[PDB]
Amino acid sequence: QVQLQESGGGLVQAGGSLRLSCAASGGTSGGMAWFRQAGYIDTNNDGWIEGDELYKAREFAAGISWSGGSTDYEDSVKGRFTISRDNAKNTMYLQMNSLKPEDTAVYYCAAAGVVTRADDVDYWGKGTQVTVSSH
CA end-to-end span of the chain: 42
List the one residue out of 107, 98, 93, 97 whose CA is nearest residue 38.
107
Compute the C-alpha angle 129/88/30, nearest 5°: 70
- Residue 70 touches which of a copy of itself, Tb ion, none (Cβ within 5-8 Å per kind): a copy of itself
x/- site string to a copy of itself, residues 95 to 124, per CB under 8 A? Answer: x-x--xxx-x--------xxxx--------
Q: Choose between 42 and 122: whose C-beta lies nearer to Tb ion.
A: 42
- Residue 54 touches which of a copy of itself, Tb ion, none (Cβ within 5-8 Å per kind): a copy of itself
Burial of 93 by CB count in 10 Å (0-12 exposed, 13-18 middle, 19+ buried)?
A: middle
Per CB under 5 A, the list member of 1, 26, 55, 75 interacting with Tb ion is: 75
x/- site string to a copy of itself, residues 42 to 81, per CB under 8 A? Answer: xxxx-xxxxxxxxxxx------xxxxxxxxxxxxx-xx--
